[PDB]
Amino acid sequence: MAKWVCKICGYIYDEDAGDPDNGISPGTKFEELPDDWVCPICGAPKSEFEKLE
Numbered sequence: 001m002a003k004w005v006c007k008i009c010g011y012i013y014d015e016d017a018g019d020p021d022n023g024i025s026p027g028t029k030f031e032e033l034p035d036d037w038v039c040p041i042c043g044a045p046k047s048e049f050e051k052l053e
């Protein structure tokens with residue numbers, strides 16, 4: 001699946017990995033993340049991510 005980079009801190013949201021520690025199961029598409037989801041490293045909002053394609 002897709003990978004999205006947090007432009008603030010360089011954290012890669014990997015859809016394949018999800019973000020379980022923050023309520024996100026593997027295979028969760030970035031667009032399907034709750035609007036309140038933020039980068040688990042720097043706290044940047046979704047808006048600060050860019051899809052790596």
Ligand SMILES: [Fe+3]
Binds near residue numbers: 009039041043
């Ligand atoms: Fe970040």
